[PDB]
Every structure is written in structure tokens, then in C-alpha cells.
Amino acid sequence: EGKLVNQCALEFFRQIKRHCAEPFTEYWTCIDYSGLQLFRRCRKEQAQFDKCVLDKL
Amino acid sequence: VAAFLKNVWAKEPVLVASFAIAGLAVILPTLSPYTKYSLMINRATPYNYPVPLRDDGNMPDVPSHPQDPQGPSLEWLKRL
Amino acid sequence: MFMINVLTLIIPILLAVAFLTLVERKVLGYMQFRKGPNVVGPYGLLQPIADAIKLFIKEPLRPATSSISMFILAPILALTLALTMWIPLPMPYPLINMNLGVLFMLAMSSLAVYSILWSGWASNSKYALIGALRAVAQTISYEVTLAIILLSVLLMNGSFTLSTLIITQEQVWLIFPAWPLAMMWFISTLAETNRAPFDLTEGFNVEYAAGPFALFFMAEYANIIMMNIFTTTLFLGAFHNPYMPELYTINFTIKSLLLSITFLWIRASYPRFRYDQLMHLLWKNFLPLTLALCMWHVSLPILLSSIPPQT
Amino acid sequence: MSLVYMNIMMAFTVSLTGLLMYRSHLMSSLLCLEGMMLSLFILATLMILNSHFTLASMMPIILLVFAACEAALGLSLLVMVSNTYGTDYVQNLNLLQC
Amino acid sequence: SMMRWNRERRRLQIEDFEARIALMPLLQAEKDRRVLQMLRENLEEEAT
Amino acid sequence: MMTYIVFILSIIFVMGFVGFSSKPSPIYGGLGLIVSGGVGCGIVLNFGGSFLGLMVFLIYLGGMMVVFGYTTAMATEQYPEVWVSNKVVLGTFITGLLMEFLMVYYVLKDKEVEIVFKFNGMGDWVIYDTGDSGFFSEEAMGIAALYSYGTWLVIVTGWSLLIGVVVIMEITRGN
Amino acid sequence: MNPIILIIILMTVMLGTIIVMISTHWLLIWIGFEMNMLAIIPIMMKKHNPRATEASTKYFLTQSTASMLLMMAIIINLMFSGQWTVMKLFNPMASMLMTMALAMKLGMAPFHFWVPEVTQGIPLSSGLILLTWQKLAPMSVLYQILPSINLDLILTLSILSITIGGWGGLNQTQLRKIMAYSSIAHMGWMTAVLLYNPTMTLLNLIIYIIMTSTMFTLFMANSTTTTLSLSHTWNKAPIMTILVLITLLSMGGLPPLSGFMPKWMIIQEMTKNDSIILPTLMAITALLNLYFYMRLTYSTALTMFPSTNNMKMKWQFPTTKRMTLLPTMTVLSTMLLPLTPILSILE
Amino acid sequence: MNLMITLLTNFTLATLLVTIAFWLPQLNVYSEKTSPDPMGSARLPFSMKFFLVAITFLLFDLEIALLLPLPWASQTTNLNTMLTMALLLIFLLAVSLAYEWTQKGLEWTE
Amino acid sequence: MWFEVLPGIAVMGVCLFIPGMATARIHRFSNGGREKRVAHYSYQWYLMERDRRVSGVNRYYVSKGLENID
Amino acid sequence: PFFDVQKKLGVDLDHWMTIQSAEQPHRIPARCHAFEKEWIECAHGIGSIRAEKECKIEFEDFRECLLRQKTMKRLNAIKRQRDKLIKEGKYTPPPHHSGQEDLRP
């Protein structure tokens, strides 16, 4: 069952990598900058990632 | 009870301010409507993992996915 | 690379304490209708260097010490606790980012009275010991309201983290919901460092030389600058952009300079309290109001549903 | 048993032996007694943090507070002794032999 | 002002905690495979 | 060397009590107890007990040992000591403290490693970071639970502190 | 002392003993002992003289050492058991430490060296509290931990307490030190029967508290602190003369009085468990207590009488003192032996 | 680790400045001086008031030690009990202060 | 006149500006151009050590993105 | 004298701090939650005399969970044998215990 998790997580990220890898990369770079990794510092990249994910997937 | 209050406000305003602030700190959490929301926010803050339940077959109030209708919702917290 | 960061904290602290003497003498000069030092350097900029080289080659008094070890360990402890109060201070990111930096600073400032007590017992004088006991009683008196005011303010913070205290004040200064705590905190920090009008030591460490007196002197001024910066972070917290930290650094630097000059401007304005009058100020004026506002800032986020986040 | 617990117990017994062989002063007795209290704090804290037993983490603070209040009481007793004789010497406390 | 901003910070704390909750199955599965990897390695080196 | 650090502090902690259980003076006794409190606090802090270590500093050392040094300094009439120029007044202090660290490093000898290496704790003793705890210090929340769970404990503690104030003011009166 | 403050402090003493009696947790046992000591310290300093400060200092040192040893026993129990229930101890090291600490709190020998001093330094009502109320909490903890108490240690402390409380009563003219050595001997008697039948422990405790309270109430009614001052009772209040001495004939352990009720029952529980030598030796030492206390009885009801002339003035004034429960406690300390099977209420 | 390095560097800078402050003017061969204040040979009398304010500090500092986990206790689910016990502790600190008041404990250092 | 105090205030202000600027630049220098990771809690430290293990060069601040999965 | 007021009146004054397996804040487990739970459920209600001799296996598992003396003994044995084999030169350590294997996750 744990491997099932590790079977379904990768297919989560591949489906981001085929369609929307660039808004996701721009979003996790701004997440990655912060020390506490704030969601509240990255709202326009979050809106772009959510928009591109709601469109393409 | 009023001339004594003016006398103690004239002589010792520090102790009058202290007893007034302490009295308001005592009584005002019960006379407030927003006190229950403190309780609700502190009991809806997820410090642990929400351990799921085995589906025996008859549990209408328990959802199957987080994006389901039933389940405890925080629309009141988002809106207020 | 971390030792570089420790040196770039501790060397500018000593330089700022050196030039605080110049800023104090100039600002107390112009407030007393006179000039401050302007002969030694251009506009007085070599007066701290001349004063330091004078005090560090001045003759030791050959002190008749009641102990060697406490006579040496009082300036050592004074300088060590003067420097270690700076390491959790968020500027906007501290040297030592710790989860309990407020409680750490309260503990390391509560340990700062042993330098006074060991300087007092390390002298043979009974009068110097009486003055040291009075100073210790004053300082541990005002540490009570330091702790209670600090607790009452951090009931709006969520935790004892000093970097979280920047996140707390991003919408409003914390002097707006806590100005009585701010003014009693400010007088309490004024009365901690034996700063005027609470300076009854000039109204205990004179057994030392002029060099170790310069050490106690610079530890006292490092405590003054440090408590002004801590009050700035605690009540007048500045805007912080994580991509340009120099905005926060210049902003809290300007506010810390204004608050240190506010100390300099209080000391050129008032007569001293008598000793029982500042014990009256603590135990009979600041402590009931401080306890009532502690009850108020406990029960107020519960009634307003404004309980700050733990993390 | 364990090693660092044996060290904290060794400190407790050393301050006990200092608390059971008086030299001159009552303040030395109170200092050895509070060194015993310190070692009790340290050993209780290491046990409570070791087992991850959460509710007992308030216990050493309790073990501090009462006992520190206890020390305050002891200091006041010493003071009254030092207000009768001028010193805190334990050999001035021998009037109850008869 | 502290009322509105502490309420918003509580909503942000709940958002971070739900990020943690969404990540805990993967971290728990990797933790299980981590400790079983290390105990199998300790068992084999104990056997040799 | 760095692994056994808690154990090293514990050894120093034991030696710290030998600083003042031999009782050279109540003032040096207080000094040795302050140093012992600092190193026992280091032992506490190195298991993740941050709040309890800061209670050692804030309440035990800066709260109570200040009062012990204060009451000691209002007794035990002082007398001068050696006060020759700097070859005595600081040089003997530095040689004595170097001999003290020589005594600290001197006890880690062949009679110690038969106990250290046969009963190796470091490698398997300090287990406070065994798995994940979450977004909270467990020790912080356990101390926080004093108000919700510890109602009777807080009642009897605050009553004992009020009675402590009353008892001190009654016995320190003389009338 | 302010009487409201006196009422608050006495209720705090009672509260500390009750917290030791009702708690299932070791921290609350320790808290109740700390509260009890902290509150009883001003009771000793009711008169503010140097002997009370010396007595309170010795009491503080001994009870603080016992409190720290109790906390070390609790900490070692938390090592070897990981829990906090007030039940049997799960290490004989922690058992030995808690037995030593409770023997220090009771003043059992060889930790008896503070009991005749402190009782000498303090007034008669505070000595009454120290010898009646302060026994109740450590005897309660001994009642609750008896599956872990070492047999040889508690019997050693018991017979050493009975011998030293016996040979302490020879050289004394002070009534308070005689009550203190009688305390030490009776604590040896109570802890003798603890691991065999603790109902007889509670019977001995209740009969001891009744007799000690009768004796201290008589000492407060006559305001006499020494043997020689007790010797003037026959001329002032002649009804006070014999009640002290039939109560003290009870305190020796002597039939048909009710102070023969504990010791006999203790022997009655130790010959069941095949110990014949040990109750024989302990009650021979109780006869040695009879020897010295009967010499005091001869001192008051007989030979050393003579009065002084100022006593003639005391004839024109009755006792306005509160002799609270003194007829009740005098009847309950002598004539209770035909109701000896009442002891089943203490199970 | 970084904290221990920082404490060690602060201690080293402190001991270095003390050592420079003692050994640098002892290069001088200035003068060996003789002939050793408001008292000359008086003993120290004890003062009860200073000890009263020290013990008052210690008891209120213990009450503050109890009050310290309040920013963490605000996050609990049983807020009615938590608020009652927080107000009860600060009220007992205030009752200790009022008893220190009315029995003349805060006098001549008020 | 009153502006004569400004060189000393300026020197003291630069002396207070240097430590904060210094530690911000050192945090960006030692962590890959970014902030230092704050680990006040066990979860933050667990994610941080997971980053240190997934980066492969014993450095938590090397972020592996979608290029490290297939 | 154990006057059990807390069971008579129905109050919880100090039962909550007593054992590790009680209701902890935020459901934090102790290190030995299972072992103490099994010793308590074994020894429940049967008295101390039967509980000493009839639940000794669960009690020794819980004592060994607390002190870890058998586990430290076993690790000292294995580490001593490993040190003796590295000293003799009859054994070589693996790469996954020397630090050259690029850890799992």
C-alpha cells in the first residue's frame, strides 16, 4: 500500500510535467525562496498554477 | 458609591484604572458574541493527522473525499 | 563563514557603543544650550578613540579586592551578557534564529545582576556593598514588570519567537493595541540599565580601574542600545521585504536611533527619583496596571477571536 | 542502570554529603539543599523528556516553584538567626540542648 | 487591526497544516521504507 | 569527542558540586552552584528541553540564586585578599582556572573509558529526535497543558505561593 | 498574629495533610508535604523568641532534607516504572529512600535528633500540632506503600526508635522533651506492626493522638512546661492533678487503661506471624518507659509537693482558659479498653 | 552548535578585553603607592527591607514562572478552563500584592 | 547648530546597519541565493533533512525539481 | 489513610498526569505507550500480589522499553565485536555504513 502511494505520487507529478511544468516551476521557486516557505508570499504564482491546472487538467 | 468613586479617581487613578481594566477583563469574555469563535478556531486547527475510518457500510455523515459536501466545513472562518 | 557573521555582529556593536558616547555628549550638549565635543576630531569624531586609549592605559587603582575571582568575573559576565543579548535579535534575520528568543533574552537579562553583585562583594567597602545591594534590588524589581509586560505583549504574537514578531506587526504597529504596555515597558527598560532618572549609582563598581570601568560602561551602553532595538522590534516593528532585507534594516536602524536619542533626551530633562519613590513607582503604580493589562491581554484575544497562531 | 542518570544521582549524593557535614554556616546548608533540588530538576527533566511523556513536562516547573518557595522560607529563617546573633553560624543554634 | 490579522494568520496556519496533512502519507511511507532499509542493513551486517 | 557532549557536561556537573559541597565559603558556594546550574541547564537543553533550560536560567539562576547571593552578601563580613600587581591579581586566577580545566580533562583517563566504552550511550542514548513530532514542541505543549488539564495543580500551587507570601511576612516581623 | 491569618494558616496545614491523604499521584504527595511545612513554620514562631527561630530552623532543615529524599525516591520510581500512581514502589532503592524520608518526617530514630529540640523551642499548642497532626501524612504514605517497604529496615527503625525513645526519658525535667521521646517510642510502636496489620497501626495512631492531645491540653490548662512547674498543680487545681497522671499511666501502656489497647494488639499481631522475641523486647522497653514516666507520676501525685505563697492569689481566680475537649479526651484516653473491638472500624 | 560557537566567541572577546584592560597599563612602572570611604572600620548592619523586597521578587518571579506558558495555552481547546486559571493566577499575584500592601510590607521602599 | 550631531548619529547608524546587512548577505551566500531554512519544529527539520538526502550532495539548499523524476 | 475523595465525588484531580497512556494533549504518544498499556490491562483489578507474578512478561517488556538495558547491552556486544574485527583486520565495513551510498528518499 505504501508503494501504491509511491505509485500514485509520481503519476501525480508526471501529469504536471507533461502539461504545466513551467507555472509549477515558477511557483515552487518562489515557495523555495522563503525560510518558512510561506504560501502568503506567492499568491500570483499560485493563481497562475491553479489557473493552468484548472485549464489543462 | 459615586462620590467615593470620584474621590478614588481623584486620589488614586492608577488603582481605579487597574480595577476597571481587571473587571472588564473578567466580565467581557462572557458578554461577547465572538468568544465562541475562539473555541471553534482552536478546535478546528489540525495539529495531527485526520485518521480515516474503515467504511462499514452505513455512515452518512462521514465523507469519502475532502471535496465532498458532508463533513465539517470552515465557510464561516473564510467569510466571518 | 559563521564566525565571520559573529565578528560582523560583535565588532559593530563595540563601535556603536564607542560612538554612542559621542552622540550622547553632543545631544546632551545641544539640549543644554552648549556644544558637545568638536575639538578632538572633525566635529568630535575622534573623541571616542581618544577616550578609549586614555581609559585603557590609565593606571589600575591597585584594588584591595575582597576576592580575585569575582573581581575578574564581573566585567567578563557583564560583557558576555551584553553581547549575547544581540544574537536572537531579528535584523530581519538573527544570528541565532531560536524558537524562544524572547525568553532567552529575559533569562540572559535576569542573569545580568550578578555582575553588579560580584562587583559589590569584590570591593572591600561596606558602602559600595550597600549601593550594589540597592542596585540589585532595583534591577530585580523592574525585571518583574519586564516579564509581565513582555508576556502580555506576546499574547498577541503566538510564541516567543522574535522573527514571528515581525510577521505579527505587518498590518499595524503593536504600539497601537498596546501603548500602556509600551510606555510602562519603556520606563521599565529605562529603570533596568540604571539610566536617568533611575541612576542612583551616580546619585558601586568604583573599586575597579578605569579600564574595567570602561568595560562595565560599554556593557551598560550595549544594554541600552540592545533594549532600544528590542523595544523597536517589540512595539514599532518595521516593514520587511524578503527580497530586500536592507529596507527593514534601515527602518529599524532609524527607529532604534530615535529611541536611543529618546533615552538621551529623557536624561537631559528630569531630576532623579529618590530610591523609595521608584520602588513606589514599580510596586504600587506599574505593577497593578501591569497585572490588570496582563489579565486584559489574556482575556481579550479570547473575546475578540484574535488568538494568534502557535506556529 | 544508565550513565548520565548515574552522574546526576552522583551529584545529588555529593550535595547530600555536603548537606550532612556542616562546616560553619547555615547558608552552606541551604546551598547544598538547593543543589539537591537542582539535581532533582535535572534528573526529572531527563526522564520526562526521554520517555516523551508529555503531561509530566509541567512537573519539573512545579518541582521548581514550590521548592524555590521553600528556599525563600529557608532564607527568611536564616535572616532571623542573623538578626539575633549577627552571624548565621550553626553553633549559635544550640540553646535547645536543655 | 490585530483582530483581522490574527484571524487571517490562523487561516494561513490551517492552510500550512493541510499542506502537512496532504504530505504525511508520502512522508510516512518513505519513513517506513527508511527504517526497514536501515534495520535490514543492520541485520545483515550483524549476521556477518 | 563531540558525540559524548551531554555526558561531558554531566561530568562537569558532578565536579561542579564538588566545588561547593566541600563548602569553601557561602559566596564561592553560590558561585559554584551558579556554574553547576549553567552546565546542568546545558544538559537539559541538549535533549530539546528548551523551555525547561530557560526556566533554569530565568527562575533558578536569575530568580533564586540572585536572592541567595543577595542574602549571603547581607551577611558573612568580608575581608581583603592578595592584591599585588598583575603577576598575582590575575595571573594566579588564570593559572588556577587552567589547572581547573586540567582537572576536567584529567579525569578522562583509563579508569573512565572502562565505563564509557563498555556502556556506550552516545550512539543510542539521546533519542529525543526519534521520528517526527509535528509543528509543535511536545515539551512546550506539555507545559502549556498546565492550564487546561492542571486545574487542581494550579490551584494548590497558587495557594502555596499566596501562603508563601503570607508566611514570609509573618515570620519576618519580629512582633 | 492576626487571627484571620491564623485561621488561614491552620486551614493550609490541614489542606496539606489532606492533599497527602487523598492524592493518587506522587507530585501531589510532595506538594502536600511542602504545603504542610510552609504553613506550619509560622505556628512555631507564634511568640517570636530566639528558641522558636532555632526550632523552626532545625525543623526546616530536617523536613526539607526529607522532602528532597522523598522526591528522589519518586524520581527513581519514575525511572523503573514510568508512572506516578501512589502504590507500591518498583525499586528497593526508591523503597529504602522513601522509608528513610518518611522516618525523617516522623522523627523516627536514628533521625530522631530534631524531635526533642524543636518541641522544646516552640509553645505547647504548636508542639501539640507537631506531635499529633504532623504524624498523619507520613503514616498515610507508609499505609499506601507497604507492599514495597523492606521488612528488616522498618523493624530496625522501629526497635531503635523504641529503645531511644525509652532511654531519652531518664534525664529530662522538661515536659515537652518527655512528650517528644514518648513520640519517638510510639512511632517505633506504630511502624512495628505496619507490615503485619496496618489496622493496628491506625489504632495505635488514634490512641496516641488522643493521649498526646489530652496531655498537651492539660499542659496548656495549667501553663506548666517543666516537671518542677507541674509539681504545683495539687495546690492550684486539684482536679487537674490526677487527670494528667491517669492519662500518663495510659501513655506508658498499662491495663486497664486504653493506652494498653495499642501495644497488646500489636503483640497480638506479631505472635501470629511467629515473631516472639521482637514484641517481647519492644514491650520490655515500654516497661522502661513506664519506669521513667512512673517516676514523674511519683513526682506529681506524691513526694515533691511544696508550694509558694503567691499561689494563694491564684485561688481567687478560676481557669478562664479554653480546655477544649479535655473531659472528652480524658475519658477517651483511659476508659476505652472495654470497647477494644471497635478497632474494626479502622479497616 | 552555532550557539555554542557564538557564546564561546563572546566569552573569548570578553576575557580578551578584560586581559588587555589589566595587562596593558601594567606595562607601566608608574608608582607603588601606599596608605589605604564613608565608613572606616564599621561593620555592616542588616536591613530587613532589602530582604523583604528580595523575597517579594522571588515569590512574584515564581508566579511569573507559572504565567509563562500562556501564549501556548491560548491555543488549547478548553478555553473556558484556561481563561479561568489564567485569571486565577494573575488574581492570586494581585492578592499577594495587596497583602504585601496592607501589612506595611511596601514601606520605606514602597 | 543642531545638525552638528548628525556625523556621530550617521556613524552609529552605519554601525547598526552593518550586522543586519551582513547576516542577510551571509544567509544568501551560504544557502544558494536564498533565505536560511527555519527549523523551529520537527516537521520543518524532517523536510529539511529530506531535502539534504534528495539533493545528493549533502546540501539541503539544492532543490531538485521535476527534472529529478522521470 | 487513603481517603479516595476523587472516586467518591467523581472528580479528576490528579489521575490525568499519573500514567503515560492517559489522554495526552494533541494525542501525543509516549515512547512506551503500548508496553505500559499492556502492563496496565494485564495487571488491572487482580491486585498487586497476583500482578507481580502473573504479569511479569509484560512488565519486563515495559521495563526494557523504558531503560533499554538489554538493547544497549546487545548494541555494545555487536559494536565491541565489530571493533575487535576491525582491529584484527578480518573484517571490512560496507559502503552503506561508511557514508558513500546517497541515502534513500
Ligand SMILES: CCCCCCCCCCCCCCCCCC(=O)OC[C@H](COP(=O)([O-])OCC[N+](C)(C)C)OC(=O)CCCCCCCCCCCCCCCCC
Ligand atoms: C515604546 C516606545 C515608547 C513608549 C512611550 C514612552 C515615551 C514617553 C516617555 C516620557 C518621559 C518619561 C519620564 C520618566 C517617567 C517616570 C514618571 C512617571 O511617569 O511615572 C508613571 C506615573 C506615576 O504617577 P505618579 O507618580 O504621579 O502618581 C502618584 C501616585 N500616588 C498618588 C500614589 C503618590 O504614571 C503611571 O504610573 C501611569 C502609567 C501609564 C498608565 C496607562 C493607563 C492607560 C489607560 C487605562 C484606562 C484608564 C481609564 C479607566 C477605564 C476606562 C474604560 C473606558
Ligand SMILES: CCCCCCCCCCCCCCCCCC(=O)OC[C@H](COP(=O)(O)OCCN)OC(=O)CCCCCCCCCCCCCCCCC
Ligand atoms: C473583580 C475584578 C478583579 C480584581 C482583582 C485584580 C485587580 C488588579 C489590580 C491589583 C491591585 C493590587 C493592590 C490593591 C490594593 C488595594 C488597597 C489599597 O491600595 O488601599 C490603599 C488606598 C489608599 O491609598 P494610600 O494608602 O494613600 O496609598 C499609598 C500611597 N499614597 O486605597 C485606595 O486607593 C482604594 C483602592 C480600592 C478601591 C478601588 C476601586 C476601583 C473601582 C473601579 C471601578 C469598578 C471596577 C469593578 C470592580 C470593583 C473593584 C473594587
Ligand SMILES: CCCCCCCCCCCCCCCCCC(=O)OC[C@H](COP(=O)(O)OCCN)OC(=O)CCCCCCCCCCCCCCCCC
Ligand atoms: C562565571 C562563568 C563565566 C561567565 C560568563 C559566561 C557564562 C554566562 C553567560 C552565557 C550564558 C550561556 C547560556 C547558554 C544557553 C542559553 C539558552 C539556549 O540554549 O537557548 C537557545 C536554544 C533554545 O531555543 P530553541 O529554538 O528551542 O532551540 C533550537 C530548537 N530547534 O537552545 C539551543 O540552541 C541549544 C544549543 C545547545 C546547548 C548549549 C549549551 C551551552 C553550554 C552549557 C552552558 C554553558 C555555561 C555554563 C556556566 C553558566 C554560568 C552562568
Ligand SMILES: CCCCCCCCCCCCCCCCCC(=O)OC[C@H](COP(=O)(O)OCCN)OC(=O)CCCCCCCCCCCCCCCCC
Ligand atoms: C483514621 C483517623 C484519621 C484522623 C482522625 C482525626 C485526627 C485529629 C488530629 C487532631 C490534632 C489536633 C492538633 C491541635 C488542633 C489544631 C489547632 C490548634 O492548635 O488549636 C488549639 C488552639 C490554639 O489556640 P492558641 O491561642 O494558639 O493557644 C495557645 C496559647 N495562646 O486552642 C488551644 O490551645 C486551646 C486548648 C485545647 C485544644 C484542644 C485541641 C484538641 C484537638 C484534638 C482532639 C482529639 C483528636 C480528634 C478525635 C480523635 C481522632 C484521632
Ligand SMILES: CCCCCCCCCCCCCCCCCC(=O)OC[C@H](COP(=O)(O)OCCN)OC(=O)CCCCCCCCCCCCCCCCC
Ligand atoms: C562605521 C563607521 C566608523 C567610522 C570610524 C571613524 C570615524 C572618523 C572618520 C575620520 C575622521 C577624520 C580622521 C582624521 C583626523 C585628523 C588626523 C590628522 O590629519 O592629524 C594631523 C596630524 C599632524 O600631522 P602633521 O603632518 O604634523 O600636520 C601638520 C600639517 N602638515 O597627523 C596625524 O595625526 C597623523 C595621521 C593620523 C591619521 C589618523 C586617521 C584616523 C584613523 C581612524 C582609524 C579607524 C577608521 C575606521 C576603520 C574601519 C572602517 C574601514
